């Protein structure tokens, strides 16, 4: 009930798009406003300085690309201070095809401070002609018949690849290396049992940089048969760790799988050894094998993952989506097999990533978006979820709850929410709300921001946690007369804007009139079912348009007021202030 | 049969506080003691008092209207005492068709190859059916696949020239809405036209078909609609893009809902983000076009859902090779026709209204939101019932009651009733005693002093 409207604050810079807060984020000396570019601009961040009143662009250092998508997506985690940003953007072509994945950036102290990036779901392109390159491990650590089915699994990978373009080399390596054969020889026979007539075992240390090296700067060459318009890649066959130093800067350019096998890489330290000579996500190109007769069975995961229809990662649009609880990430990846979608678990540096989607993948998962929200739902007694919608599943949507990894396990899937209304876009918004703030989030709020009928457009419901699952106990109740409103549109959770110790939310519907924004605040047991505040856009500005887009609040420490709540608009961004009053 | 009073002072005042409260205008029903209160109590509380049953004053709520016609009456006037609803008919008598303009809008994605070769010569045979329903129909040729950005299409140069796999040779580059055919009597029109088109393609599985209706109900004088029955067949073989999906090639701004053909071409079309469904059934319900969904057997569950928002709506199942589509389209207009709603337009939260819907199927529903009857059949009258009441002493007012899909309406006129509409202007006609007038066994008197007995 205590917003004050009439000291409300504006922001916006003069070259300002109409995407100029289309997601707002309050860190402590101002505001993060982001502004997704429109047409032919690119994507922007702004630093909003609080006392300033003035928008400044933020500049990404090392940022190597930057699309119309810049500012899209941005969260921050409130137990560490940290900022992720995505870039759905990264737009490149694989032959005829093109590929659309994106480039996170997180800020870990601020936006002035260090900055790390990496490619969540990113899909090296693989064209029709490849130069693969077999490097294998002669080391005297292997028994003659592993060394032996490490031939039969390069035969085999051949024999599977004939009548393709692709032309292959074999190079073995041990204290020295030596090329079995090159592209040109693989060109005049096809035969990969007479290729591999003449290696003879090493039987001496394992060099792997030497080699790789090696690979790179004496095996890629056009004289010995290598395309140079076709994809570079390296397999590289390995027993244990390197007996050498140093680094495959020389190699950089190709596409490096890795398969370590056997007791050596049984303990984990040992394994991210290997890490460094492949390529990102390790968790794609490292492959830990702890028998020898497991390379046979590994032919369909190295086969085929080395004009499409049915896509995987090519077009995942990794990053629409975030969300960072106690050091943790996750970006969701909406394209992934097949628009089905599905959610990344970052590694901290944004150097690997996991894939958790939908189990199993029916038709029906397909087109639904999964991925579109994503929200973490934290607790200490009880185990910590991971909320997200596919808006789109079955044309009507859906929400599905993942549990965090509990001991050595990994994500499971542990309930699923339907929507009822086609187009409703059920799930399109999610926001998680712990009420009383005793370390347990109890409330899973669900935005069905398209619902129509009964003249009032948009719905939010209420889900709390029970033993066996969530359960819908209630919904915020908007006032009618928007029958296109889009109220649920934005959901957050405010902090405390009442002072008394219950935390409050508000809801964004930006297509009421010129935009309003509904405070909910929380009572004994959940949320009250009614708003005790509406504001509208036209009292804030007159020219004002979707005002309520996006919405975050914070307690802030340094200024006049109880909380700060900031509400993005058509190229406007505001800042509103609790007051005890 | 129960009545709060707080704080009355006159017969208005009394009808004002609710509608079990009655006034007693005889005169002298007060003793000098009482205060002038107590005339206005329940029925039963006043004859208990010595009041007779003449001199009560109990105004009801009133319905007076004003009227071969599809919709009758044409004209009502209700007088509304709050809390009592007042009851009035409608009846609805189904007319000999209408002439009807049907577009069609179909995918011509490269599924629809083969759909595509069958409805270039099909301009002859709906302009039959058309005939066959009623009198003289116009028929009309849309198209449209997708938007042109990512990753709805491929935007590689090459297959943007050919969105179709590589072999085929006849085909055109991916497009949001081209409007091929004005509405026209004429089948030869319709063949030259629609055989110009060529097949496209796409790359995700949805569409942007829900783009192509919102631009043909935005565009009523580049498609042609006359003010007669408005047909919109949409015919595709996959699922639909809606608001929210333009967030993958990073449009995020709403559809505005306006026309933006130029060149009969959507070209803004990557500027604005997919309608919603229900700005979609908005638009459609304005302008007075019914859809009639024609999707292939996987696609039939799932447009059915559309009905449930769309109230003039149909699904039939496309063959794949849509040559049925003509059988598809007769039976959606029988569906369509046969089922009637009557509603009214927005209304404030002092009036409310019911219907109660009298079928000639035999079926009978009562106090709904909405006017609901099916298996209506030409000249078989149904009567609707409509009873509306006012929570409160109402401000003049009025509002329209709508058969969907047809632009006649009941104009409906209300008035409240605060007043009480007394008696005995004479007889003898002899009193008040200071200059001022009577006015319901209750002296008024004219200002100058004032106060009771005057
Ligand atoms: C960005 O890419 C360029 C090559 O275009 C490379 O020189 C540079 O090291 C890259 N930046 C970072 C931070 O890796
Ligand atoms: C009502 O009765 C009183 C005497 O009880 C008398 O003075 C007065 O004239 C009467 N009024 C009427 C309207 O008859
Ligand atoms: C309307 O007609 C029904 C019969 O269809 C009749 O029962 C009812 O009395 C009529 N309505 C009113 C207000 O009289
Ligand atoms: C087509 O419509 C026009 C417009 O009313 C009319 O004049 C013409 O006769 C029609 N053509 C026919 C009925 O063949
Ligand atoms: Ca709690
Ligand atoms: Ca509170
Ligand atoms: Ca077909
Ligand atoms: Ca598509
Ligand atoms: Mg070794």
Redesign the interface.
Known sequence: YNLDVRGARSFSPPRAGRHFGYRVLQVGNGVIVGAPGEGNSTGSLYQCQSGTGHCLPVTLRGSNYTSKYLGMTLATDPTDGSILACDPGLSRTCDQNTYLSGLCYLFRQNLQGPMLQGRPGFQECIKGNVDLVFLFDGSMSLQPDEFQKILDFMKDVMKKLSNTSYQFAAVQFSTSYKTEFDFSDYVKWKDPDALLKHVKHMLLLTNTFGAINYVATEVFREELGARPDATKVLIIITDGEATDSGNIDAAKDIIRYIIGIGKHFQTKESQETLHKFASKPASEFVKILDTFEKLKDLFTELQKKIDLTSFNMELSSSGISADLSRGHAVVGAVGAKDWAGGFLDLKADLQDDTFIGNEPLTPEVRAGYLGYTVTWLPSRQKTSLLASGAPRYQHMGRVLLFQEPQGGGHWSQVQTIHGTQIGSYFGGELCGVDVDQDGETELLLIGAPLFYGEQRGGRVFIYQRRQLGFEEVSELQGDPGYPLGRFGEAITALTDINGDGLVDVAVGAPLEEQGAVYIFNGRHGGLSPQPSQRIEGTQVLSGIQWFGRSIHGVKDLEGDGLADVAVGAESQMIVLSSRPV | QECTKFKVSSCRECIESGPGCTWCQKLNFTGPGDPDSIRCDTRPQLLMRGCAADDIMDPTSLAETQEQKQLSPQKVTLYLRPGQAAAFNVTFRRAKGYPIDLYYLMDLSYSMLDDLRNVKKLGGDLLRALNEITESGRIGFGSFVDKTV??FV???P??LRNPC??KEKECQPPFAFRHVLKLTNNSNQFQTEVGKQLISGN????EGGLDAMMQVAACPEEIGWRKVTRLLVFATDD??H????G??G?I???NDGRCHLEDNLYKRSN?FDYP????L??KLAENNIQPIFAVTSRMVK?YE??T??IPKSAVGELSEDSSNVVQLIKNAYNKLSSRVFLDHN?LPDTLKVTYDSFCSNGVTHRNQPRGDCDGVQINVPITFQVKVTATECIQEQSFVIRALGFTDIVTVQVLPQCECRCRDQSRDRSLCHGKGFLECGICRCDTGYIGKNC
């Open positions: 990512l990753p491929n935007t590689h090459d297959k796999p590589n790359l995700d599985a949805p699922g639909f809606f608001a929210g999906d967030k993958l990073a995020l701004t709403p500027e919603s469904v229900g700005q059934a908005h799932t859902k559309l449930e928002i927005a």
